[PDB]
PDB file of all heavy atoms in Angstrom:
ATOM      1  N   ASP C  86      68.985 -15.551 -65.094  1.00  0.00           N
ATOM      2  CA  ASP C  86      68.391 -15.359 -63.769  1.00  0.00           C
ATOM      3  C   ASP C  86      66.902 -15.108 -63.961  1.00  0.00           C
ATOM      4  O   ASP C  86      66.462 -15.047 -65.070  1.00  0.00           O
ATOM      5  CB  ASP C  86      69.110 -14.185 -63.043  1.00  0.00           C
ATOM      6  CG  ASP C  86      68.945 -14.201 -61.500  1.00  0.00           C
ATOM      7  OD1 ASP C  86      68.125 -14.962 -60.925  1.00  0.00           O
ATOM      8  OD2 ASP C  86      69.595 -13.430 -60.766  1.00  0.00           O
ATOM      9  N   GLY C  87      66.122 -14.987 -62.902  1.00  0.00           N
ATOM     10  CA  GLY C  87      64.727 -14.638 -63.064  1.00  0.00           C
ATOM     11  C   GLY C  87      63.813 -15.795 -63.400  1.00  0.00           C
ATOM     12  O   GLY C  87      62.619 -15.583 -63.632  1.00  0.00           O
ATOM     13  N   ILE C 149      72.286  -8.714 -55.186  1.00  0.00           N
ATOM     14  CA  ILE C 149      70.880  -9.138 -55.037  1.00  0.00           C
ATOM     15  C   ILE C 149      70.656 -10.501 -55.699  1.00  0.00           C
ATOM     16  O   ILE C 149      69.932 -11.385 -55.184  1.00  0.00           O
ATOM     17  CB  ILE C 149      69.925  -8.084 -55.586  1.00  0.00           C
ATOM     18  CG1 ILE C 149      69.510  -7.143 -54.470  1.00  0.00           C
ATOM     19  CG2 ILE C 149      68.668  -8.735 -56.152  1.00  0.00           C
ATOM     20  CD1 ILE C 149      70.524  -6.097 -54.180  1.00  0.00           C
ATOM     21  N   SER C 150      71.320 -10.641 -56.841  1.00  0.00           N
ATOM     22  CA  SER C 150      71.422 -11.881 -57.578  1.00  0.00           C
ATOM     23  C   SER C 150      71.932 -13.054 -56.734  1.00  0.00           C
ATOM     24  O   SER C 150      71.410 -14.157 -56.823  1.00  0.00           O
ATOM     25  CB  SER C 150      72.361 -11.653 -58.747  1.00  0.00           C
ATOM     26  OG  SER C 150      72.069 -12.537 -59.802  1.00  0.00           O
TER      27      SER C 150
HETATM   28 MG1  LIG D 601      67.660 -14.426 -58.586  1.00  0.00          MG
END
Side-chain angles (χ1 to χ4, degrees):
Chain C
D86 201 349
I149 268 81
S150 206

